Symmetry: C3
Subunit: 599 residues, 3 copies
Amino acid sequence: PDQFRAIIESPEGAGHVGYQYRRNTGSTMRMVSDVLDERVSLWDFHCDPSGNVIQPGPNVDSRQYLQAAIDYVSSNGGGTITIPAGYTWYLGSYGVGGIAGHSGIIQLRSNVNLNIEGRIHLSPFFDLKPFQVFVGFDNGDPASSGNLENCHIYGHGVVDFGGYEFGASSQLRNGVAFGRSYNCSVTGITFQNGDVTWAITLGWNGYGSNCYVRKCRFINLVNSSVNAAHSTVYVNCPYSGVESCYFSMSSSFARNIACSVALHQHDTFYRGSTVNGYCRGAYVVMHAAEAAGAGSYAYNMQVENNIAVIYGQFVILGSDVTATVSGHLNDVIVSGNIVSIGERAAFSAPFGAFIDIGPDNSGASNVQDIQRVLVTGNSFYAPANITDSAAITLRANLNGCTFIANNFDCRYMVYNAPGTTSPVVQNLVWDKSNVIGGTHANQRAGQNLFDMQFASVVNSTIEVQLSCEDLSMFSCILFPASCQLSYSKITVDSAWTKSMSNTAVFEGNQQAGANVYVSYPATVNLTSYNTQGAVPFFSTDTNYAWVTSAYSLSINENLDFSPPATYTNKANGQLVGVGYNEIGGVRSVSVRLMLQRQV
Amino acid sequence: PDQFRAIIESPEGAGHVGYQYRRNTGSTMRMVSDVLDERVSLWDFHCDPSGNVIQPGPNVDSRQYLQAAIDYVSSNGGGTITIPAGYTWYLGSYGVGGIAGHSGIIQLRSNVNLNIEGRIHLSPFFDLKPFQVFVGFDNGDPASSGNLENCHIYGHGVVDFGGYEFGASSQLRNGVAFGRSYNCSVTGITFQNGDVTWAITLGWNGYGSNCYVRKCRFINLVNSSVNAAHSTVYVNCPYSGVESCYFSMSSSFARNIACSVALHQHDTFYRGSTVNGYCRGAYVVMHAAEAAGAGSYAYNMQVENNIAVIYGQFVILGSDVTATVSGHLNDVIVSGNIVSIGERAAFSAPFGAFIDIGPDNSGASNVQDIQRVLVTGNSFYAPANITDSAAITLRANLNGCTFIANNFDCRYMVYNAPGTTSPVVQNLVWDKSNVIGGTHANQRAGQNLFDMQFASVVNSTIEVQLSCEDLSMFSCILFPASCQLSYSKITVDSAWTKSMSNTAVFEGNQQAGANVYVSYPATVNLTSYNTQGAVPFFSTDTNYAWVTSAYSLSINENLDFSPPATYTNKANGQLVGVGYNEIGGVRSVSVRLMLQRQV
Amino acid sequence: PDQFRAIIESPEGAGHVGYQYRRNTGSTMRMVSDVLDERVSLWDFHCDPSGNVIQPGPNVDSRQYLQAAIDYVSSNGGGTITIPAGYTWYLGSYGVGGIAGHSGIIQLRSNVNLNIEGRIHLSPFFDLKPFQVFVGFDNGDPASSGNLENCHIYGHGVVDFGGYEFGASSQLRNGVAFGRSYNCSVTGITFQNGDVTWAITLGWNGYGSNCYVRKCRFINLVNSSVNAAHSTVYVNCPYSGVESCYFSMSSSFARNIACSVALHQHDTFYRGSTVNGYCRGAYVVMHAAEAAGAGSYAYNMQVENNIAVIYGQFVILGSDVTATVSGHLNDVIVSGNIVSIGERAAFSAPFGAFIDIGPDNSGASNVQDIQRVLVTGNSFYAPANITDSAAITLRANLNGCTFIANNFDCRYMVYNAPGTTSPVVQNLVWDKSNVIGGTHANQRAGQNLFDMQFASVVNSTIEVQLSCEDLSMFSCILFPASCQLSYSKITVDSAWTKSMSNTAVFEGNQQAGANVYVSYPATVNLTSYNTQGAVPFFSTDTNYAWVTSAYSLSINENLDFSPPATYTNKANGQLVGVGYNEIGGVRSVSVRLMLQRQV
Ligand SMILES: CC(=O)N[C@H]1[C@H](O[C@@H]2[C@@H](O)[C@@H](O)O[C@H](CO)[C@@H]2O[C@H]2O[C@H](CO[C@@H]3O[C@@H](C)[C@H](O)[C@@H](O)[C@H]3O)[C@@H](O)[C@H](O)[C@H]2O)O[C@H](CO)[C@@H](O)[C@@H]1O
Ligand SMILES: CC(=O)N[C@H]1[C@H](O[C@@H]2[C@@H](O)[C@@H](O)O[C@H](CO)[C@@H]2O[C@H]2O[C@H](CO[C@@H]3O[C@@H](C)[C@H](O)[C@@H](O)[C@H]3O)[C@@H](O)[C@H](O)[C@H]2O)O[C@H](CO)[C@@H](O)[C@@H]1O
Ligand SMILES: CC(=O)N[C@H]1[C@H](O[C@@H]2[C@@H](O)[C@@H](O)O[C@H](CO)[C@@H]2O[C@H]2O[C@H](CO[C@@H]3O[C@@H](C)[C@H](O)[C@@H](O)[C@H]3O)[C@@H](O)[C@H](O)[C@H]2O)O[C@H](CO)[C@@H](O)[C@@H]1O
Ligand code: NA
Ligand code: NA
Ligand code: NA
Ligand code: NA
Ligand code: NA
Ligand code: NA
């Protein structure tokens, strides 16, 4: 009996109290401790050396206790540790061993899930220092790390980075680095109040698979001029992605340095998410330096059905090389997104764009291999004052990109800055079903809507269709004489162009190329012979040697004659057609024509 | 020892039985009560004044017990209360205090989540009365309410409204009113068997953020002629939305009064959901009267990837004004939806439409500021008998809407009823990539496919492309003389139009406008001069003064001559072109031409 | 007192230890056993006849214990049974009763959910045998089965099929057969390591509703030449679907026999998922033999926003008949998908296709009723060597399908094999906004890009637009003389076609049909009369009786004359137009023209 009371009050007491489920005589005859052992929480490890529970709080460092919990549950083949609601659990020191090379705080372990219902905060020990809060590598050298498998972080709780600024731009900070990560995920968690490099990284240089970030919130994760750069989620393993997340920043620095997602391996996605306050939406990039685990190609890349207010570029495409590996990007889709450039002064943030074809990290524009991209069914808007806004800023070599059935309402459609890079362009396709908005009408003095500042263009299609007038623009499309143009189709629909001085401009007369197919409106002065009856009209100018046919876009105010409805050319570069003189006489008219070459 | 047995059997007994997790000597030395205190259920509060548990059932009012649970868990900083599976928990009285002004039953509190695994039912005390089952306001006046934060309702359970009808049309009923709600959500729950105004409302007049409804079912939530109106989810805070839900109604009244979602603030979405039996899919509206918390603009509005069978309109756009605030709607995307009008008689429910540009609640059509809308990649079908079916019913002023790459298979493409409203239309863009289906071929006697019953149209594009014949229709597009038309492009592709009497009709001869760009087929009678050789042909009629060129759509059955291939006009309004008389003689022909103006 | 110690140590002991939540005097005075009874796990039933717990393992058959758990929890109105983490639970025998007719192992029951956190494995008793692991039918004859309602399987755990091959091709294997299933779902689970027919089936012949598969992984579920066929999820009830799943196969047999999803009833969807290694993406089919529970029509079918690498066809459409029922498929949308054919030899797997219009299970091509399909905003790629790759393989009767704003980069656009089936085609619409890629340029000797090997085509549109040259192809579009063509529009844009010998080919001269609307480029030899001045030019050939107009696509190298810009025809089939001889003389020229008929 003394024994008994003593046993009951001891830590083995629950192990002596019997239990059978719902008094079911067919159920297991268990002890209370067995049922309690089905679950586990931080309270089961958050104790002093004598076993007495310790209350969390800002003067208590919870790190060792949470690590002890993870270590133990790992030793039993896994389970889910609850981080209890109603408390804030502070972290106040660095971890040890394999995660120390990563500035790690907690080491994650395979099959050990964290159900974060309460709050995890960083103590001021971390102020001005690097850190990665949760780390799944088990070695300081990621190349020598084991894998992290089957690790899920989820719940209604919060990771709060304490508001601390970076101490130096060279520092790195992260929330969750899953490492070489297979079937890992973060769901439901709010990451907030920091100055960090990433909130979550998935994978390592292509090693990993099936990692996801779903229904998470990321709020105010950049706050200082020290922060070098930020991507809220960096996706560095295949078959992985981000869905239904919320990203918000409020700091000015974020408008210049921060991106919501980086998709950096094949079969990755970003969908259904909302972004506000960031410079950039998503990078879609194959870095050769990251090609170890899944190959040198980033393919099956999906950015779909997002909502964004950004200050720089929505999707940024890239690929690059190292001394021994070449990176390639292909088979991309960008669809269903509704994006705007937020209110800002012209040139006050990185050049506004829906798609950017960006140079590598060294600024090289001649290393890229980007092709088979489909941009369809998106909307883009930039306010009228934002000069630096484009459907595409095409700033590095491009091996193909297709635009179908978008609505682009910004300053430029196609842009690259002159005297910068001279990209080599192939297979740029701009379908006629792209709707060009009117917000920037009257703002385009001196500017070309499609400003083709490239080394060369081949196998490309630009079908310009206006939907309102903008007589301020210099031209709808312009090719400098430095840009070769071949095996291409360039058209300017005549609607809303009657009063334009210039429609398409070929400063090197490139439209004469053998395999160039063009059409655009022009005004032409003609003069007829004096004969009564069928009578020829000829252009006064001789710069139509390339024209295969032309037709009238003008009415004929005359009763006594009519100019030709249609024209062809002559060897001397004049247009010629047969009109009709009811009464004879030399006629002189100025007519608006659709000039056509091989179309 | 007596002490001991007594202590063990008392409510403090579990607090005396020790426990250590898995017999781990490094774990906390706890008591059983500590581990049990990690969770909480309704059973912990569902007791009489002596502490004896009460069984739920239809004669027991569970309200006070659930409120006591919520109140207590709130006092500890939050947690999750389980509503146990295997039981039905009846609610049978109104709450008290701040929620009484809202006819509230339960008051939600911040950080207190409800895991509803069992069923919550309404008792007949609520029959013929108003109610809001869960309310997150803390004050009868929402303007004086505190916020509700971090409150999630989730699980496999059910909210059942008892089937009771409304007592009066002026009454309001709701499931969950989150109030001024920040990071709140409903997930997994079935709402069923009612006559209610809303199932869920998010936010209050723009106050709130990050509220969501995900994987919920709403079944049979309207059942009587008393019910004034119904929106299953009303989204009245930004950065919030509905995803992957199921909405079904079976009552006839629902086909006339019910909508699945209302998106009423910026950065809101409705996606991936299935609707059956409703009048309407979604409202997308900025009410000036709701502009307090997030501004006067509804922007970044997304309706994507839904499946619907409805009886009225799929998406309804609106904006309005108050005495001192003006509401604006812009930057909308409607994409990927597959929608039909369900089987019904013509005119038996509100006018069928994929998009409706609706007048305000007073019927005013001259207050709206709706622009920058993209409608792309959707399908719409209405059965052939449904006269009242349109791609767009454009019934109020429109400042822009773009249609690209849709498939519309219904009676009308563009419609507004004559002698009703006379909307002022700008920037209506109907791209040629919109496919017009053939289900209503042969049903269109007396009707215009695009019936342009507007005050005016400017900066608009209508590119009509048929894909089968319908010789029953009066015209492909018709503008009454009352409609001004300027700075617009209107084309009718000739395919399937050879036998149409009328293609495009301009009852005020508006196609002559200086900045109108048109083309469409017409039949024209011509007569030539008698001269052998090149010889002119002239139209007998003189109503072609606006024509810039025309070309043959007809073969020439003759050997001895040919009419011109192409024509222009003369000051008197005749067409003229130069054909060829192999042998002389006056010729008279009737030819099908493509008439072109400035295109 | 002896009593007392004995009571405490007995299975009723926890039922004597009091508990009150957090020492709250307003809370229920309960016993520990009451709180423990709020949850249930397999441990509560996994015991020998004396009540002693049994450890799971490969020599222990857990089946009877899990069934006993499900049976008991069912008897209390439901709940959720946990399958504990950290253990592998082996199944080693067949179930009994109603599921034996289905080779069932476990019988699911209404309102009883399974939270699978650990692993469920099949023991080698099942090697070479049929099985269905979880079965929701309650009768061997599904027609006589009751329903399964409100049953959810979810968690981070795993179902492992043991790697065992099928014993015979006629055998069936499944993971979860929900049966006649209403509000059932599988979420989060990994199904792996098998040779099975299905992983999950939803519904039975249209009976069921609201069943879903979300965030599941299916890995390596086909492994042998014995396996007849495989669909990873078969959706056989309405208002149901698959979202955000991952499907991977590695076996060669899978490339020939396996499909990820089968959508077989109305209001069903497949979205946001990633597929690798399969033959097929999704079937979308109405089998008449499955029409009992939800009617004879499959409508509101959605395949959207998926990523796939497959070896055969992405979406396969079908409908068929039985002796007394006819199946119909309509109102389908296929949007936003990014798909490729994986690296393979030509003809090494089933014919590669984005859409296939497939014959019934007997090979009949004359039973189908498929219409109102929208295919928009997708990308498709096949490597250049894959001869057997098409945007659409149209192999059975088609009543309509619309393609808008896709990017197809493969060998064929439209294909059917000659001398096979002769489908009857109506309402095939290929919009000009479909972008035709260049990967297969130079590979197309002897081949037609659009190979119209049909019995007949009516009410169809083919608007061919190239975006690069491919002079290897025989023609852009070809109709054999056996194919009737009427009430259709067929155009070939001239861009990149100057050097093509053949553009459009009508081997039966079908383009002359009264209601055929065509245009395409051709080279034509002309000769003029000798007259100075306006002078006629006539084609030497007489096969242009069908031409309504033609215009020049060639420049005029001459100074002394010009050919006509535009032409019409004469009764003898010559073209004729009026050019200009500055000086007289008979002229002879060869010109590239755009030939037009009724356009
Ligand atoms: C090529 C490369 O190292 N890739 C890293 C990736 O690095 C990014 C880089 O691609 C670019 O976007 O600039 C940012 C700026 O922050 C990153 O570079 C910075 O970080 C890397 C990686 O840090 C090292 O490796 C981590 C795995 C360790 O945890 C960390 O302690 C550190 O040793 C560094 O090498 C650069 O010098 C530094 O400028 O980042 C992703 C995501 O973390 C990673 O998966 C990839 O390997
Ligand atoms: C302008 C406005 O009041 N907005 C309310 C919104 O009201 C809708 C209204 O926009 C329109 O759609 O008609 C319906 C018909 O039911 C609603 O009007 C009805 O309800 C409102 C709101 O009810 C008041 O305010 C609630 C917050 C309280 O809980 C309730 O007790 C009541 O005091 C009412 O003022 C109208 O007179 C009545 O006709 O409804 C949404 C969603 O509830 C709300 O967020 C918004 O403020
Ligand atoms: C018409 C039909 O039976 N439909 C079944 C469906 O059957 C598919 C069939 O549509 C086609 O796709 O071939 C596969 C090849 O595996 C299936 O046929 C095979 O299975 C069926 C169904 O199996 C019977 O019915 C199940 C409900 C029982 O559980 C099972 O024990 C068996 O009695 C069979 O009749 C065929 O002979 C066999 O070749 O399969 C789906 C999904 O299971 C089902 O819902 C539908 O009724
Ligand atoms: Na490091
Ligand atoms: Na150059
Ligand atoms: Na009120
Ligand atoms: Na008017
Ligand atoms: Na069977
Ligand atoms: Na035939």
